[PDB]
């Protein structure tokens, strides 16, 4: 919900126009298995929900924001860098899972269209190219194992190459 | 590997001096067999016997490293060519692949658009 | 490093007896274990039954290593303090030798792969 | 919390009566192994700190749990052996295994390079005594001499390396302190600085060269096939390579390039020899070279994928190869010669063990994902980003890994055993227990090995 | 009461040894008290209880 | 000839005498050792232990980051213009030259 893209609206309605035979055997079984064990499992789920009654709140995810970046903290010091290294690592763990959501958005694009797939969508493939390219050039993907000090050097390497290209052109 | 036809009824002496030598083959065979037969058909044995032919077989491969190879001949240097040789062979394979890859990153981009790995 | 304003005869200086001594330290207990260990293998070389349950001259073995070890640790607490004190006083007197550098976000090369 | 229960396992064996011994050493180690799985599995955002540096913490170490798991497993295997020996020597021996595990707890927990190294070399002395005494075969002294000749000549160069780095840059001690790291500028003086740090872990992590350290220690086994599990722990004991390459030298890895190439032929040519050899233990000993060569290939690439595969392989090999040595132990205790050709025939005498032979041999191959496939597949996918040609070399290894397992099976599937009058009794209750306690943790790690392959995963 | 002390003289030492390790490593928290309430990461002004982080 | 060395020992009982045993010497202690205390470590550390291997130790923010990312996707798409990634750690920092 909300974060998931999902389909706009589901169609499909029963026609049953050609022939009689024995109607639709799948629809006849759909009404049969709805009361056979689908109704029994729904009654058992309702009985388990009623038996819960009192439940724990659980305050979900903790905040903890900013605490000064590694770029702001000039000169090497163990007391200052430690909290900056934790801040970068927490962002890197989130940025890994941001890609995974858009990855699952592309998974939804393949199924919910089926026949078209490549010809349609147009937004999910474009959003994937906007994030992955930003992830590849900024958040490691070339800077080996994760390090906060190496990321600042990687950001400076991209900035120096861009400034040399902009001044020439 | 066998070169001509499969050797079984081909090239043999027609009952000459080889017949006396062929009879000697069964004499040594039965000599090792009879001592095996005596140490087999008793119920009070319980345990796998030695058999010195298989003990010396393991000793031929595991040991005999430095008692042998004391004349380090030109054949050992030919074996060394198959030793160090292949290790230096890939040095002109992996480096040529790397210099092909690294030059494609900097000038004339060949990097993948959807490469989040590594 | 080397001795300057310190003299021999009586191992602690007594003039610099300001720092607190080691009281029930884990370092004292490990030498106490060695004092017990010396009271285990004495019944092994000289043939005596059971290293754990034997003759009770082991109380001398425990006390001796604790007694010598206490003054040895007192020498450790003294000498490490003096070595640190002469180090701090050298920076405070000269000042020009020890230079301070602060605030830098210098550019460094980034490694590939 | 892991200091002074293993030290409290020391007086347990001495104080206990002659009728007991084995009942106390195993039961008071299984509950200690329960507490390791209870407490060490917790992680925050990054690496924690349990205490001040006597024993530090865990960053990417579920390998500590494996040693605690083998803490009673070695005592399980050495039951038929050391049953006819002196009761005072039984008390002497178990304490030597405990002392090995004592320093092994220390080395994995301590996040130092100085305290780690001296306790890394403190595992060498107990193993020396364990190999050179109770050795069933002759010339066991060559297995003892070369154990300290190959290792110490490579590891004493760490004293001239590690102290040199801390004299220049701050101190190595706390490791999480060591982020003052300056990039190595690739100079001729820095050439031997990199080599001395690596060569110490080029011996215990067997390459193609300097690899004779391993098979001699296994052929001239410490005890039949029981104390070989400690030598499996020494193979994974070269985990300092994960820490040295990451922290001490990240920039200069041009010298790593020939060492991957040296270990690349330490994959094919080490597997080729492991096809004809007569000793059943040596057919595990040379296969253990190739599976541990995978890590040496992985680490020197330094890509994030390789670390995921390596840390998995350290745990994978520690429970699969050791299980294979337990199968070699069960065959040696009956025949008393480790000849593969002589000991031929399962199911006719050993019906239940044959299924355990399968669950141990096929794990050398990439089965339905246990930890070995998860270990190997990430490394092969990491080598492609390094260079495209690698899978041609790596693919040959995938063929000979089948020539590891099936050749061990076929030479035991051939139903004959004509000369054998022994092996009348199938298996003891503790004998089949070794087969279960090695394989069932691998079977439980099929479901979710998230807490196994974890360097920031 | 009388037979348990002679038969299980060593059987009590190992779990009690764990308790000794459980207590000694816990007491190391007082040695590391610098920036317990300080350093902005999980810092919050506690009122009903003194020293939240150990 | 050695006159002292020739004294070989070969005795593997297994089934002959104790009938049902895991190890030699004392059958009453053997049942209590090979079948009881070995199996209590086989039961507690493997079944009750498995509820600690992967079953609920939280474990390095694996499930925490899912609730963290989902609220950040909706936040920077509705209010912000870039899709959660553009520049890493350094917004207008000190330049190289």
UniProtKB/Swiss-Prot annotation, chain B:
Keywords: Acetylation, Electron transport, Membrane, Mitochondrion, Mitochondrion inner membrane, Phosphoprotein, Respiratory chain, Transmembrane, Transmembrane helix, Transport. The chain crosses the membrane at residues 75-94. It holds the Pfam family NDUF_B4. It is found in: Mitochondrion inner membrane. GO terms for cellular component: mitochondrial inner membrane; mitochondrion; respiratory chain complex I. It is a single-pass membrane protein. The modification Phosphoserine is found at residue 15. PANTHER family: NADH DEHYDROGENASE [UBIQUINONE] 1 BETA SUBCOMPLEX SUBUNIT 4, NADH-UBIQUINONE OXIDOREDUCTASE B15 SUBUNIT. Accessory subunit of the mitochondrial membrane respiratory chain NADH dehydrogenase (Complex I), that is believed not to be involved in catalysis. Complex I functions in the transfer of electrons from NADH to the respiratory chain. The immediate electron acceptor for the enzyme is believed to be ubiquinone. Belongs to the complex I NDUFB4 subunit family. Complex I is composed of 45 different subunits. This is NADH dehydrogenase [ubiquinone] 1 beta subcomplex subunit 4.
Swiss-Prot record, chain C:
The chain crosses the membrane at residues 54-73. There is a minor unacetylated form of subunit B14.5b. It is found in: Mitochondrion inner membrane. It is a single-pass membrane protein. One of its GO terms (cellular component) is respiratory chain complex I. The keyword Membrane applies. Keywords: Acetylation, Electron transport, Membrane, Mitochondrion, Mitochondrion inner membrane, Respiratory chain, Transmembrane, Transmembrane helix, Transport. Its main location: mitochondrion. One of its GO terms (biological process) is mitochondrial electron transport, NADH to ubiquinone. Complex I is composed of 45 different subunits. Interacts with TMEM242. Accessory subunit of the mitochondrial membrane respiratory chain NADH dehydrogenase (Complex I), that is believed not to be involved in catalysis but required for the complex assembly. Complex I functions in the transfer of electrons from NADH to the respiratory chain. The immediate electron acceptor for the enzyme is believed to be ubiquinone. Belongs to the complex I NDUFC2 subunit family. This is NADH dehydrogenase [ubiquinone] 1 subunit C2. It comes from Bos taurus. The lineage of its organism: Eukaryota, Metazoa, Chordata, Craniata, Vertebrata.
Curated annotation (Swiss-Prot), chain D:
It is a multi-pass membrane protein. Pfam families: Oxidored_q5_N (PF01059), Proton_antipo_M (PF00361). It catalyses: a ubiquinone + NADH + 5 H(+)(in) = a ubiquinol + NAD(+) + 4 H(+)(out). Core subunit of respiratory chain NADH dehydrogenase (Complex I) which is composed of 45 different subunits. Belongs to the complex I subunit 4 family. It comes from Bos taurus. Disulfide bonds: none annotated. GO terms for biological process: aerobic respiration; electron transport coupled proton transport; mitochondrial electron transport, NADH to ubiquinone; mitochondrial respiratory chain complex I assembly. This is NADH-ubiquinone oxidoreductase chain 4. Keywords: Electron transport, Formylation, Membrane, Mitochondrion, Mitochondrion inner membrane, NAD, Respiratory chain, Translocase, Transmembrane, Transmembrane helix, Transport, Ubiquinone. GO terms for cellular component: mitochondrial inner membrane; respiratory chain complex I. Its EC number is 7.1.1.2. Core subunit of the mitochondrial membrane respiratory chain NADH dehydrogenase (Complex I) which catalyzes electron transfer from NADH through the respiratory chain, using ubiquinone as an electron acceptor. Essential for the catalytic activity and assembly of complex I. InterPro entries: NADH4_N, NADH_Q_OxRdtase_chainM/4, NADH_UbQ_OxRdtase, ND/Mrp_TM. The chain crosses the membrane at residues 20-40, 58-78, 92-110, 114-136, 145-165, 194-214, 222-242, 254-274, 282-301, 306-328, 349-369, 391-411, 433-453.
UniProtKB/Swiss-Prot annotation, chain E:
The chain crosses the membrane at residues 8-24. It is found in: Mitochondrion inner membrane. One of its GO terms (cellular component) is mitochondrial inner membrane. It is a single-pass membrane protein. Keywords: Electron transport, Membrane, Mitochondrion, Mitochondrion inner membrane, Respiratory chain, Transmembrane, Transmembrane helix, Transport. Signal peptide: none annotated. It comes from the Eukaryota. Belongs to the complex I NDUFB1 subunit family. Accessory subunit of the mitochondrial membrane respiratory chain NADH dehydrogenase (Complex I) that is believed not to be involved in catalysis. Complex I functions in the transfer of electrons from NADH to the respiratory chain. The immediate electron acceptor for the enzyme is believed to be ubiquinone. Complex I is composed of 45 different subunits. This is NADH dehydrogenase [ubiquinone] 1 beta subcomplex subunit 1.
